[PDB]
Design an enzyme around this catalytic site. Structure first.
Site, short mmCIF file in Angstrom:
data_model
loop_
_atom_site.label_atom_id
_atom_site.label_comp_id
_atom_site.label_asym_id
_atom_site.label_seq_id
_atom_site.Cartn_x
_atom_site.Cartn_y
_atom_site.Cartn_z
N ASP A 35 0.82 -1.20 0.00
CA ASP A 35 0.00 0.00 0.00
C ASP A 35 0.86 1.26 0.00
OD1 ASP A 35 -1.97 1.86 0.30
OD2 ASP A 35 -2.42 1.38 2.41
N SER A 199 -0.70 15.50 -12.18
CA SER A 199 -0.95 15.13 -13.56
C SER A 199 -1.19 16.38 -14.39
CB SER A 199 -2.16 14.20 -13.63
OG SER A 199 -2.53 13.92 -14.97
#
Length: 330
Positions: A35, A199
Protein backbone atom coordinates in the site's frame (compact mmCIF):
# COMPACT_ATOMS: atom_id res chain seq x y z
CA UNK A 1 20.82 -5.72 -2.85
CA UNK A 2 17.54 -6.13 -4.69
CA UNK A 3 14.22 -7.93 -4.29
CA UNK A 4 11.54 -9.06 -6.74
CA UNK A 5 8.12 -10.49 -5.83
CA UNK A 6 5.03 -11.36 -7.81
CA UNK A 7 1.79 -9.63 -6.85
CA UNK A 8 -1.53 -11.36 -7.59
CA UNK A 9 -5.11 -10.03 -7.80
CA UNK A 10 -7.28 -11.28 -4.93
CA UNK A 11 -10.31 -11.81 -7.19
CA UNK A 12 -11.61 -11.56 -10.75
CA UNK A 13 -12.14 -7.78 -10.47
CA UNK A 14 -8.61 -6.84 -9.29
CA UNK A 15 -10.11 -5.44 -6.07
CA UNK A 16 -6.66 -5.62 -4.50
CA UNK A 17 -3.32 -7.37 -4.97
CA UNK A 18 -1.46 -9.64 -2.56
CA UNK A 19 2.29 -10.26 -2.38
CA UNK A 20 3.92 -13.02 -0.30
CA UNK A 21 6.13 -11.77 2.55
CA UNK A 22 8.39 -13.88 4.79
CA UNK A 23 8.29 -12.89 8.48
CA UNK A 24 10.36 -14.39 11.28
CA UNK A 25 12.57 -17.41 11.79
CA UNK A 26 11.70 -19.96 10.55
CA UNK A 27 9.84 -17.97 7.92
CA UNK A 28 6.10 -17.46 8.25
CA UNK A 29 4.75 -16.46 4.83
CA UNK A 30 1.81 -14.06 4.83
CA UNK A 31 0.12 -12.50 1.80
CA UNK A 32 0.14 -8.74 2.29
CA UNK A 33 -1.47 -5.83 0.46
CA UNK A 34 1.37 -3.50 -0.56
CA UNK A 35 0.00 0.00 0.00
CA UNK A 36 1.81 3.11 -1.24
CA UNK A 37 -0.87 5.19 0.53
CA UNK A 38 0.02 4.16 4.09
CA UNK A 39 3.10 3.47 6.19
CA UNK A 40 2.35 0.62 8.62
CA UNK A 41 3.29 -3.03 8.13
CA UNK A 42 0.59 -4.84 10.10
CA UNK A 43 -0.52 -8.44 10.19
CA UNK A 44 -3.22 -10.76 11.40
CA UNK A 45 -1.64 -12.60 14.30
CA UNK A 46 -2.00 -14.99 17.20
CA UNK A 47 -3.02 -11.88 19.18
CA UNK A 48 -5.95 -11.00 16.91
CA UNK A 49 -9.38 -11.30 18.56
CA UNK A 50 -10.49 -14.79 17.55
CA UNK A 51 -13.94 -13.76 16.29
CA UNK A 52 -12.26 -11.28 13.93
CA UNK A 53 -10.15 -13.92 12.16
CA UNK A 54 -11.89 -15.74 9.28
CA UNK A 55 -9.50 -17.67 7.05
CA UNK A 56 -6.44 -15.41 7.15
CA UNK A 57 -2.96 -16.74 7.76
CA UNK A 58 -1.62 -15.41 11.06
CA UNK A 59 1.81 -14.39 12.31
CA UNK A 60 2.71 -16.07 15.61
CA UNK A 61 5.64 -14.17 17.13
CA UNK A 62 6.18 -16.77 19.88
CA UNK A 63 7.20 -19.22 17.12
CA UNK A 64 9.84 -16.88 15.67
CA UNK A 65 13.27 -17.03 17.27
CA UNK A 66 14.06 -13.54 15.95
CA UNK A 67 10.86 -11.81 17.16
CA UNK A 68 11.16 -9.27 19.98
CA UNK A 69 8.35 -7.31 21.62
CA UNK A 70 8.85 -3.59 21.05
CA UNK A 71 8.06 -2.74 24.64
CA UNK A 72 5.31 -0.19 25.20
CA UNK A 73 4.64 0.37 21.50
CA UNK A 74 1.09 0.42 20.16
CA UNK A 75 -0.47 1.32 16.83
CA UNK A 76 -3.90 2.25 15.50
CA UNK A 77 -4.85 3.12 11.94
CA UNK A 78 -7.94 4.20 10.05
CA UNK A 79 -8.08 4.14 6.27
CA UNK A 80 -10.00 6.28 3.77
CA UNK A 81 -12.42 3.44 3.07
CA UNK A 82 -13.59 3.42 6.70
CA UNK A 83 -11.67 0.32 7.76
CA UNK A 84 -9.33 0.16 10.75
CA UNK A 85 -7.03 -1.99 12.85
CA UNK A 86 -4.85 -1.68 15.96
CA UNK A 87 -2.51 -3.60 18.23
CA UNK A 88 1.02 -3.90 19.57
CA UNK A 89 4.44 -4.21 17.91
CA UNK A 90 7.27 -6.70 17.43
CA UNK A 91 10.52 -6.34 15.57
CA UNK A 92 11.47 -9.28 13.37
CA UNK A 93 13.19 -10.24 10.13
CA UNK A 94 11.10 -9.50 7.04
CA UNK A 95 11.92 -10.58 3.49
CA UNK A 96 10.24 -9.64 0.21
CA UNK A 97 11.28 -11.39 -2.96
CA UNK A 98 14.74 -12.16 -1.61
CA UNK A 99 15.39 -8.75 -0.01
CA UNK A 100 15.79 -8.98 3.78
CA UNK A 101 15.39 -6.35 6.49
CA UNK A 102 16.34 -7.19 10.06
CA UNK A 103 14.65 -5.34 12.93
CA UNK A 104 11.55 -4.40 10.90
CA UNK A 105 8.57 -3.22 12.94
CA UNK A 106 5.83 -5.82 12.47
CA UNK A 107 2.60 -4.45 13.87
CA UNK A 108 0.51 -7.26 15.33
CA UNK A 109 -3.26 -6.72 15.17
CA UNK A 110 -5.30 -7.19 18.31
CA UNK A 111 -8.40 -5.77 16.59
CA UNK A 112 -9.43 -5.42 12.95
CA UNK A 113 -12.61 -3.98 11.45
CA UNK A 114 -15.19 -6.10 9.70
CA UNK A 115 -14.00 -5.45 6.14
CA UNK A 116 -10.62 -6.98 7.04
CA UNK A 117 -12.21 -10.00 8.72
CA UNK A 118 -14.45 -10.54 5.71
CA UNK A 119 -11.54 -10.64 3.27
CA UNK A 120 -9.91 -14.02 3.80
CA UNK A 121 -7.26 -13.36 1.13
CA UNK A 122 -5.46 -10.42 2.79
CA UNK A 123 -3.29 -11.28 5.79
CA UNK A 124 -2.23 -7.67 6.46
CA UNK A 125 -0.79 -4.55 4.82
CA UNK A 126 2.74 -3.48 3.94
CA UNK A 127 2.88 0.31 3.82
CA UNK A 128 5.10 2.03 1.27
CA UNK A 129 4.22 5.72 1.77
CA UNK A 130 6.59 7.94 3.75
CA UNK A 131 7.50 6.92 7.30
CA UNK A 132 6.14 10.22 8.65
CA UNK A 133 2.67 8.59 8.39
CA UNK A 134 3.56 5.53 10.50
CA UNK A 135 1.17 5.25 13.46
CA UNK A 136 3.35 3.51 16.05
CA UNK A 137 3.43 5.32 19.39
CA UNK A 138 5.38 6.54 21.30
CA UNK A 139 8.27 5.85 18.90
CA UNK A 140 7.35 6.11 15.21
CA UNK A 141 8.70 3.28 13.05
CA UNK A 142 10.13 3.07 9.54
CA UNK A 143 8.61 1.35 6.53
CA UNK A 144 10.17 -1.73 4.97
CA UNK A 145 11.40 0.42 2.06
CA UNK A 146 12.88 3.07 4.34
CA UNK A 147 14.75 0.36 6.28
CA UNK A 148 15.98 -1.35 3.08
CA UNK A 149 16.87 1.79 1.16
CA UNK A 150 20.52 2.24 2.07
CA UNK A 151 21.28 -1.39 1.16
CA UNK A 152 19.52 -1.32 -2.21
CA UNK A 153 21.50 -1.02 -5.45
CA UNK A 154 19.34 2.05 -6.22
CA UNK A 155 16.91 3.70 -3.74
CA UNK A 156 13.78 2.80 -5.69
CA UNK A 157 10.91 0.38 -5.90
CA UNK A 158 8.62 -0.27 -8.85
CA UNK A 159 4.98 -1.32 -9.20
CA UNK A 160 3.93 -3.27 -12.28
CA UNK A 161 0.34 -4.30 -11.57
CA UNK A 162 -1.51 -6.58 -13.97
CA UNK A 163 -4.98 -6.28 -15.42
CA UNK A 164 -6.74 -9.49 -14.44
CA UNK A 165 -3.26 -11.04 -14.17
CA UNK A 166 -0.24 -11.18 -11.83
CA UNK A 167 2.38 -8.44 -11.82
CA UNK A 168 5.57 -7.51 -9.99
CA UNK A 169 7.00 -5.38 -7.20
CA UNK A 170 10.76 -4.82 -7.55
CA UNK A 171 13.06 -3.24 -5.00
CA UNK A 172 16.41 -1.67 -5.80
CA UNK A 173 16.41 -1.81 -9.61
CA UNK A 174 14.46 -0.81 -12.69
CA UNK A 175 13.66 -3.73 -15.04
CA UNK A 176 14.18 -2.13 -18.45
CA UNK A 177 12.41 -5.08 -20.13
CA UNK A 178 9.16 -4.40 -18.25
CA UNK A 179 7.98 -1.29 -20.11
CA UNK A 180 7.85 0.24 -23.59
CA UNK A 181 9.30 3.58 -24.61
CA UNK A 182 10.78 5.82 -21.92
CA UNK A 183 9.98 6.52 -18.27
CA UNK A 184 8.73 10.06 -17.65
CA UNK A 185 9.63 11.38 -14.21
CA UNK A 186 7.58 13.96 -12.35
CA UNK A 187 7.94 15.88 -9.09
CA UNK A 188 6.66 14.59 -5.75
CA UNK A 189 5.52 16.47 -2.67
CA UNK A 190 6.02 14.58 0.57
CA UNK A 191 4.26 17.25 2.64
CA UNK A 192 1.25 15.02 3.39
CA UNK A 193 3.33 11.83 3.63
CA UNK A 194 2.15 10.48 0.28
CA UNK A 195 3.60 9.96 -3.18
CA UNK A 196 1.79 13.13 -4.25
CA UNK A 197 2.24 14.47 -7.77
CA UNK A 198 0.46 16.61 -10.37
CA UNK A 199 -0.95 15.13 -13.56
CA UNK A 200 -0.93 17.46 -16.56
CA UNK A 201 -4.45 16.61 -17.79
CA UNK A 202 -6.73 14.02 -19.31
CA UNK A 203 -8.62 12.78 -22.35
CA UNK A 204 -11.76 10.65 -22.68
CA UNK A 205 -11.65 8.01 -25.41
CA UNK A 206 -10.44 9.47 -28.70
CA UNK A 207 -11.25 12.99 -27.50
CA UNK A 208 -8.91 15.95 -27.33
CA UNK A 209 -6.53 16.22 -24.41
CA UNK A 210 -7.51 18.76 -21.74
CA UNK A 211 -4.46 20.43 -20.19
CA UNK A 212 -5.21 20.93 -16.52
CA UNK A 213 -3.27 20.30 -13.31
CA UNK A 214 -4.63 17.45 -11.18
CA UNK A 215 -2.86 16.96 -7.84
CA UNK A 216 -3.21 13.45 -6.47
CA UNK A 217 -1.51 10.46 -4.88
CA UNK A 218 -0.12 7.26 -6.41
CA UNK A 219 -1.83 4.67 -4.20
CA UNK A 220 -1.48 0.95 -4.86
CA UNK A 221 -3.78 0.24 -1.90
CA UNK A 222 -6.81 1.98 -3.44
CA UNK A 223 -8.72 0.00 -6.07
CA UNK A 224 -10.25 2.77 -8.17
CA UNK A 225 -9.31 6.08 -9.81
CA UNK A 226 -10.76 9.05 -7.86
CA UNK A 227 -10.72 12.39 -9.70
CA UNK A 228 -12.48 15.76 -9.55
CA UNK A 229 -16.20 15.71 -10.24
CA UNK A 230 -15.80 17.74 -13.44
CA UNK A 231 -13.39 15.16 -14.93
CA UNK A 232 -15.49 12.21 -13.83
CA UNK A 233 -18.70 13.72 -15.25
CA UNK A 234 -16.94 14.29 -18.59
CA UNK A 235 -15.92 10.62 -18.68
CA UNK A 236 -19.31 9.10 -17.82
CA UNK A 237 -21.14 11.46 -20.18
CA UNK A 238 -19.61 9.36 -22.98
CA UNK A 239 -21.33 6.18 -21.74
CA UNK A 240 -25.02 5.87 -22.66
CA UNK A 241 -27.13 5.28 -19.59
CA UNK A 242 -24.36 5.97 -17.05
CA UNK A 243 -25.40 7.89 -13.95
CA UNK A 244 -24.30 8.70 -10.44
CA UNK A 245 -26.29 6.67 -7.95
CA UNK A 246 -26.39 7.92 -4.37
CA UNK A 247 -27.91 4.58 -3.29
CA UNK A 248 -25.08 2.54 -4.81
CA UNK A 249 -22.39 5.07 -3.89
CA UNK A 250 -21.05 6.30 -7.22
CA UNK A 251 -21.29 6.08 -10.97
CA UNK A 252 -22.91 2.99 -12.44
CA UNK A 253 -23.38 2.08 -16.07
CA UNK A 254 -25.26 -0.52 -18.14
CA UNK A 255 -23.34 -3.75 -18.24
CA UNK A 256 -24.09 -3.86 -22.00
CA UNK A 257 -21.88 -0.78 -22.57
CA UNK A 258 -18.51 -0.62 -24.26
CA UNK A 259 -16.43 1.75 -22.09
CA UNK A 260 -14.13 4.38 -23.59
CA UNK A 261 -10.49 4.61 -22.55
CA UNK A 262 -9.23 7.31 -20.20
CA UNK A 263 -5.87 9.04 -20.70
CA UNK A 264 -3.91 10.88 -18.02
CA UNK A 265 -0.90 13.13 -18.48
CA UNK A 266 2.51 12.71 -16.89
CA UNK A 267 4.43 15.76 -18.00
CA UNK A 268 4.30 15.68 -21.81
CA UNK A 269 3.71 11.89 -21.76
CA UNK A 270 0.37 10.11 -21.76
CA UNK A 271 -0.82 6.91 -20.03
CA UNK A 272 -3.88 5.26 -21.58
CA UNK A 273 -6.24 3.26 -19.37
CA UNK A 274 -8.24 0.88 -21.62
CA UNK A 275 -11.99 0.97 -21.17
CA UNK A 276 -12.13 -2.60 -19.87
CA UNK A 277 -9.98 -1.56 -16.87
CA UNK A 278 -12.83 0.74 -15.80
CA UNK A 279 -15.41 -2.09 -15.51
CA UNK A 280 -15.94 -3.35 -11.94
CA UNK A 281 -18.85 -5.59 -12.81
CA UNK A 282 -22.41 -6.00 -11.55
CA UNK A 283 -23.29 -3.97 -8.46
CA UNK A 284 -24.85 -7.14 -7.01
CA UNK A 285 -24.88 -10.68 -8.35
CA UNK A 286 -27.07 -10.95 -11.46
CA UNK A 287 -27.56 -7.19 -11.86
CA UNK A 288 -27.27 -5.51 -15.27
CA UNK A 289 -26.01 -2.33 -13.57
CA UNK A 290 -22.20 -2.27 -13.38
CA UNK A 291 -19.92 -0.26 -11.05
CA UNK A 292 -17.55 2.25 -12.59
CA UNK A 293 -13.82 2.30 -11.99
CA UNK A 294 -13.52 6.09 -12.25
CA UNK A 295 -15.30 7.87 -9.38
CA UNK A 296 -15.48 11.35 -7.90
CA UNK A 297 -12.97 12.39 -5.24
CA UNK A 298 -15.35 15.10 -4.00
CA UNK A 299 -15.54 14.70 -0.25
CA UNK A 300 -12.42 12.51 -0.04
CA UNK A 301 -10.33 15.65 0.06
CA UNK A 302 -7.68 14.26 -2.30
CA UNK A 303 -7.48 12.77 -5.78
CA UNK A 304 -6.28 9.16 -5.85
CA UNK A 305 -4.48 7.43 -8.72
CA UNK A 306 -5.37 3.95 -7.51
CA UNK A 307 -4.96 0.58 -9.16
CA UNK A 308 -7.20 1.39 -12.16
CA UNK A 309 -4.65 4.02 -13.20
CA UNK A 310 -1.43 2.43 -11.93
CA UNK A 311 -2.01 -0.95 -13.60
CA UNK A 312 -1.96 0.80 -17.00
CA UNK A 313 1.68 1.81 -16.31
CA UNK A 314 5.08 0.73 -15.08
CA UNK A 315 5.53 2.99 -12.04
CA UNK A 316 8.82 3.99 -10.41
CA UNK A 317 8.75 5.15 -6.79
CA UNK A 318 12.11 6.93 -6.58
CA UNK A 319 13.16 7.37 -2.95
CA UNK A 320 16.26 9.44 -3.65
CA UNK A 321 16.99 12.42 -1.39
CA UNK A 322 14.45 14.35 -3.45
CA UNK A 323 11.79 11.74 -4.26
CA UNK A 324 10.16 11.56 -7.70
CA UNK A 325 7.67 9.32 -9.55
CA UNK A 326 8.20 7.76 -12.96
CA UNK A 327 5.56 6.42 -15.36
CA UNK A 328 6.01 4.38 -18.53
CA UNK A 329 3.58 2.65 -20.83
CA UNK A 330 3.88 -1.15 -21.02
Amino acid sequence: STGSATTTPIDSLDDAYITPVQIGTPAQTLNLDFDTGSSDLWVFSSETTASEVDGQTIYTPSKSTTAKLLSGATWSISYGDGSSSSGDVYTDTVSVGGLTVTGQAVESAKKVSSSFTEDSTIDGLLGLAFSTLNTVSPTQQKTFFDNAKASLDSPVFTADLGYHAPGTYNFGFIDTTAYTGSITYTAVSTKQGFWEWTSTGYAVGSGTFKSTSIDGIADTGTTLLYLPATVVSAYWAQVSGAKSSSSVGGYVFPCSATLPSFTFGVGSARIVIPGDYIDFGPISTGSSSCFGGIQSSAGIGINIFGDVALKAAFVVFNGATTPTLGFASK
